[PDB]
Amino acid sequence: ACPPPGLGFGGEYYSVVDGACSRDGSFFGGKPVLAQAVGYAVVLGFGAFFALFTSFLVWLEKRYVGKTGLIASVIVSQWTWAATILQSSNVAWQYGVSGPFWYASGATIQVLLFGVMAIEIKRKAPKAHTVCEIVRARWGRAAHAVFLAFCLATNVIVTAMLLLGGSAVVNALTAINVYAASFLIPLGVVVYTLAGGLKATFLASYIHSVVVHVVLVVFVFLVYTSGNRLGSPRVVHDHLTAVASAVRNCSAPLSHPDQACGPVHGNFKGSYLTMLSSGGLVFGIINIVGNFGTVFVDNGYWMSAIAARPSSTHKGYLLGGLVWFAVPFSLATSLGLGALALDLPITAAEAAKGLVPAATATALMGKSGSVLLLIMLFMAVTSAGSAELVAVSSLCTYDIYRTYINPDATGEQILRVSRATVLVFGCLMGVLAVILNLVGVSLGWLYLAMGVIIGSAVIPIALLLLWRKANALGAILGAVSGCVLGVTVWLSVAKVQYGRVDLDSTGRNAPMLAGNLVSILVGGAVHAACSLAWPQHYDWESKEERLVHAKRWIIKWGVAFTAVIAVVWPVLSLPAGRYSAGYFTMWAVIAIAWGTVGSAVIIFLPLVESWDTICKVCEGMFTNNAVYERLDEMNLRLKAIMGDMPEAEERYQEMQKEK
Amino acid sequence: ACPPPGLGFGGEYYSVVDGACSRDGSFFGGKPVLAQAVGYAVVLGFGAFFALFTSFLVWLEKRYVGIASVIVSQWTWAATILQSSNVAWQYGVSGPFWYASGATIQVLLFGVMAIEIKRKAPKAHTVCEIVRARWGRAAHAVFLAFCLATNVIVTAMLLLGGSAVVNALTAINVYAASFLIPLGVVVYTLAGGLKATFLASYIHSVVVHVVLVVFVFLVYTSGNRLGSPRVVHDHLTAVASAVRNCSAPLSHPDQACGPVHGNFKGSYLTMLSSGGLVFGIINIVGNFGTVFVDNGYWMSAIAARPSSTHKGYLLGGLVWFAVPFSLATSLGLGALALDLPITAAEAAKGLVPAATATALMGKSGSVLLLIMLFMAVTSAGSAELVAVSSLCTYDIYRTYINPDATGEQILRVSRATVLVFGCLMGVLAVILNLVGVSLGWLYLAMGVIIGSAVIPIALLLLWRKANALGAILGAVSGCVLGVTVWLSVAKVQYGRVDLDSTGRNAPMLAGNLVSILVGGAVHAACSLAWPQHSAGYFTMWAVIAIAWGTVGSAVIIFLPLVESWDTICKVCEGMFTNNAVYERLDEMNLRLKAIMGDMPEAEERYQEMQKEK
């Protein structure tokens, strides 16, 4: 009997050789699950396929036709990319229930912050088109290359993250060359971003939201409610308290030292259910800082804020954070600590590239749901990778070509410059994800190492539009007194704590907490010092009564779902220890309810707010009412010409009554 | 299954009956592979299927509306699919390079021919008219007879190759599949209204080039059975290696096993090969005859439009240089590298590309090959019938039977000739079927009967002196002496004269060269007398073959679409939208507005009617 007592869950992964039936060495090192043909269709024929459908809908709603419920969809479409499905489900594997809660407790605050800066941009700089323009203007000439460099480095980092995770899963599921599946990703995205327009559209975001939010409910209901394997979330409690049980022995070849076994280190008493994880709050602050270099440096978020009117949509985006909270909670608790319950043979190196969801999906459903994950992730990568190409293209066409090459540029000269920039950046990004694959850098290592490179530019940019002193000398003297002084400490703490300096030691948990806290607390502390000595006293020159109301509903009610969700809830949940069978069964119901009162507003509210358009389009796709109205309106004209002319009236009457 | 040592890929091919650890007699040894019903629906139901679809597509163009592909339609017939991957099988890699050596020569010669035929006399409709125009009246029965003989030979080749494949794959009767193909073909050439439309050529090229890539990707890259330039390489060196287990029981002396004469040390990768070289000169001799003595190309050049025509010449020449290489190399190296029994006589009939299609991928493969051949057989046979009709009605009726020609008699005689010739060649393709001879013998005999008078035709349109007596003397002398040499060299040095005893390399090359050179020299002499005035190499080969394939079926399949995007967008509108109704309803509304205005009272009294609504 190879399955030892107390573990009858996973038997398909225990094979017997020469006795003792050594545990499997990995999960995806075996034969491919799906055919190699489908991977080629998904990599190449997905961005193009999602473009002609969008243009078809545009043609329909333009041919026949000519509010605080749809902005909640563009918020989700913007905030979701290939680190909510993958990275949120890795920290759940590593630590437990503290993973998929701290991920959503730091990535939602940045939703609330977005909107305060949207107000300060419609009444302080409504003619920017970028973020460096509200920086050249102001500050000087030297303060236009440091911030341009940081803004472009952020785009590079996010694109590298979305390519390194979109290929490491298609390789595992379809057995394609990870180098061949890496260069081909930034061609479908380029096809999509050049086929259907070039800017953001309120219709594509809705489709992205509905696809993601349907796959979400499928997975959550399969894991918890409907299922003959792991449904009825009482089995999960026993399953994952058996793995952490101290009676289980994990030594010799029963469990390799790179997998999940025995008690978990850093928690209280040893459990995947406690909220007392030291591997918790450490992925707290680190994440929070990381979710400031994306909403305050990346030009995509600024462009989204500019392209949205806040006069009547100041309330909508607060609904874009309370529905997006279910995306990394209902998915990283179902496909997260659902791989722990079934005792999968997942390796730490395999979990760092974003392969935990690809294991639970291929185990619970096999060939019938390993396709759903690909569709979800590749809608999330083709809708977020197309937001970074536009950002860098708009940045280059407005900050290096139209202001340092030829100011006398016509409206036709800058229309192919942008297209060429998109194409060249897409090709160059495919010649960075092949090198990054052969050095061994994964999505997990790069996600945490984002607040050290970028993060010295968060406070200087934030104070650019809040309080009107903003000393120019110090914004560039704090961005370079930050980043380098951050990397120095991050590699020095890693220097004398493990010995050598490499990928496995510089990014464990300790060096990267010291880097993300010294690269943002210095860039903003030394800048404030120079700002109190030579205040420039900017005059903000180089309906107001309605707009001042905007910074009262998002700042007073703004802090009502940032402390209830992140401050009082954890401290109230602390006095629970290991979750009892009746207490975890409430946590699961909260997780399900957030996703059902979740993906039932974004799918239906925009439909009922635009019913007068979907009715008009059908009135014309099927019926022929237009022909009838024209024939009526030209019949009445003959009636008019005939009314005053009396001789023809009698003749027509007799010609008609003889029919 | 008994595998000999060193042959793991050699599986069920080696039999185990009474032990006898040896291969079977033939791949197609009397075991049906395809359903017998599909073959009847392909032989008959395909000629009358590509015609009504073309008429549909052309009817749409005339209801809503009001050059590099023509170099493929007349060439991809049953000579480059059914024999290129026969010389590839017989001599390895050197074959599908010497075979596609006249591919460029053909297209350049045809370009020169067109640019000269427009400039000298742009109203001929035949070459049998110009032959009287320049030379004497008596030089007319010669260059009519040779043209008819060439047409007969090419029709026979395209019928004897398409019957064997359907006899093998579908198990249709070999005699009942030889009298029915030139019935679907004649149905097609009558339903299409004769003529040479450009719409059919594009669809032909599209189907050929979509089947090509499907077959190539199954061999080199996307293959779970055979793929990559190294699995093919080590199978190639394993099939022909120093160790030779196949002497008495294994691989009967007419199969493929053991080093072959010619190729250096029996290596199926070199170029120094007598067999590869001889089918060089012979292929060139044949291609000169099928372009100068044939009449299909003379008629095809009448369409002209020289600039785009020569652009198409170059582009389609590159494309149809690519296509032979890719398909022939793929199928021949699949048949060689993979253990597969082919009789020495079963390759000459053109079944080698049929064996690698039903084994590499199977059932779904076979039908593809079938259509890929049966789209290419009812596209050159119809051209040949149209050519012979145009050559006979304009040359025996218009000038000999009745000098007068009403506009309706021409169509009478044209369709009469097509109908008679489409059936009279079904009995010459069934009488030659039970008497031995297959595609291999005709493809080499074509250079003896034809090509006796090929230089005379070249000098008629191009060279000033061009005496009339030289043409007749050269033609008769070349023909008679070529026949004598062909039937004499097979007696001495080879013993008896038989069907297979005359179709070797030296006896046919001798006949071809004697047929050409003496005729050319005699014509010139009389005209001057009376001037009336390893692993890396194969990897590079595979890479460049795929490169030709990609610079192949990607410039004639998509470029015409973007070139004519306006027309393909105008028809689609006319189709799923009713913009046509609005375009005139609004105009009537504007006219009614025009009549009003000049009438004061009606203008106001009409308004309250709208206000009522």
Please list the alpha-helical segments (H only) found in B174-261. 181-191, 198-217, 228-239
Q: Given an 8 Å threshold on Cβ–Cβ distance, is A638 in contact with B589?
A: no
Q: Which residues, including other chains, have CB under 8 Å from residue B500's CB and lie 6 or more apart?
A: B345
Whole-number Å distance between alpha carbons of B582 and B589: 10
- The two tokens of residue B346 are 């079963």
Q: Which amino acid is at A160?
A: A
| Residues on chain B touching A633 (C-beta within 8 angstroms) | 589, 610
- The two tokens of residue A443 are 């999505």
Q: Given an 8 Å threshold on Cβ–Cβ distance, is A637 in contact with B592?
A: yes
Q: Given an 8 Å threshold on Cβ–Cβ distance, is A643 in contact with B588?
A: no
Q: Is B492 touching A (CB cutoff 8 A)?
A: no
Whole-number Å distance between alpha carbons of A320 and A494: 39
Closest CB to B605: pick one of A631, A638, A640: A640
| Residues on chain A touching B606 (C-beta within 8 angstroms) | 636-637, 639-640
> Å from B574 to nearest chain A CA?
16
Cβ–Cβ < 8 Å for A116, A558 = yes
| Residues on chain A touching B585 (C-beta within 8 angstroms) | 627, 630-631, 634
Cβ–Cβ < 8 Å for B145, B295 = no
Q: Given an 8 Å threshold on Cβ–Cβ distance, is A641 in contact with B596?
A: yes
Query: Resolution in A, one decimal?
Result: 3.4
Whole-number Å distance between alpha carbons of A453 and A150: 8
Whole-number Å distance between alpha carbons of A150 and A454: 7
> Å from A626 to nearest chain B CA?
9
Residue from B282, B300, B297 nearest B101 by CA: B282
User: Nearest 5°: phi and psi at B23?
Assistant: -75, 160
Question: Among all residues of chain A, which has the CA nearest to that of B590?
Answer: A634
- The two tokens of residue A555 are 């700042």
Q: By what method was this entry solved? A: cryo-EM
User: Nearest 5°: phi and psi at A435?
Assistant: -70, -40
Question: Among all residues of chain B, which has the CA nearest to that of A639?
Answer: B606
- The two tokens of residue B56 are 């549909």
Per-window interface: B 585-604 vs A, CB < 8 A = 585-586, 588-589, 592-593, 595-596, 599, 601-602
Which of A56, A637, A638, A639 is best to mutate for the B interface (most B CBs within 10 A)? A637
- The two tokens of residue A374 are 């690909």
Whole-number Å distance between alpha carbons of B588 and B580: 13
Q: Which residues, including other chains, have CB under 8 Å from residue B376's CB and lie 6 or more apart?
A: B76, B77, B78, B81, B204, B208
Q: A23 pairs with which residues across the strands?
A: A14
Taking each helix axis from N to C end, the angle separating B274-292 and B84-91, rounded to the nearest 10 degrees, works out to: 160
Closest CB to B581: pick one of A627, A633, A641: A627
3-state helix, strand, coil in chain B (%, to 5): 65, 0, 35
Q: What's the full length of chain A, in residues?
A: 659
Buried b (16+ CB within 10 A) or exposed e, B267-299: bbbbeebebbbbbbbbbbbbbbbbbbbbbbbbb
Q: Given an 8 Å threshold on Cβ–Cβ distance, is A634 in contact with B581?
A: no
| Residues on chain A touching B596 (C-beta within 8 angstroms) | 637, 640-641
Closest CB to A637: pick one of B581, B586, B606: B606
H or E element at residue A424: helix A416-429
Question: Among all residues of chain A, which has the CA nearest to that of B595?
Answer: A641
DSSP A580: P
Q: Given an 8 Å threshold on Cβ–Cβ distance, is A634 in contact with B589?
A: yes
Whole-number Å distance between alpha carbons of A6 and B92: 65
DSSP A123: T
Taking each helix axis from N to C end, the angle separating B535-550 and B198-217, rounded to the nearest 10 degrees, works out to: 150
Whole-number Å distance between alpha carbons of B515 and B524: 15
Which of B361, B573, B584, B585 is best to mutate for the A interface (most A CBs within 10 A)? B585
Q: Is the dihedral of CA A588, A592, A593, A595 positive or negative?
A: positive
| Residues on chain B touching A643 (C-beta within 8 angstroms) | 602, 605
Angle at B411 between CA B405 and CA B414, to 5 degrees: 100
Angle at B200 between CA B194 and CA B204, to 5 degrees: 130
CB atoms under 10 Å from CB of A583, counted, come to 14
Q: Is B563 touching A (CB cutoff 8 A)?
A: no
Q: B23 pairs with which residues across the strands?
A: B14
Q: How far is CA A658 from CA A642, A648, A652, A654, in A?
A: 19, 16, 10, 6
Cβ–Cβ < 8 Å for A621, A69 = no
> Å from B327 to nearest chain A CA?
23
Whole-number Å distance between alpha carbons of B188 and B610: 60
What is the secondary structure of B99-151 as a DSSP string? GGGHHHHHHHHHHHHHHHHHHH-S--SSSTTHHHHHS-TTTTHHHHHHHHHHH
**SS3 assignment, position B595:** helix
Q: Is the dihedral of CA B167, B172, B173, B178 positive or negative?
A: negative
Chains A–B, number of C-beta pairs less than 8 Å apart:
40
Q: How far is CA B12 from CA A15, A211, B226, in A?
A: 34, 50, 16
**SS3 assignment, position B14:** strand
Q: How far is CA A423 from CA A44, A194, A323, in A?
A: 16, 9, 34
| Residues on chain B touching A628 (C-beta within 8 angstroms) | none
**Cα first-last separation, chain B:** 88
- The two tokens of residue B594 are 């025009």
Count of helices and strands (H, E) across chain A: 37, 0
Q: Which residues, including other chains, have CB under 8 Å from residue A336's CB and lie 6 or more apart?
A: A88, A89, A92, A93, A99, A100, A356
Residue from A142, A343, A370, A134 nearest A255 by CA: A343
Which of A624, A641, A644 is best to mutate for the B interface (most B CBs within 10 A)? A641
Q: A14 pairs with which residues across the strands?
A: A23
Q: Is A252 touching B (CB cutoff 8 A)?
A: no
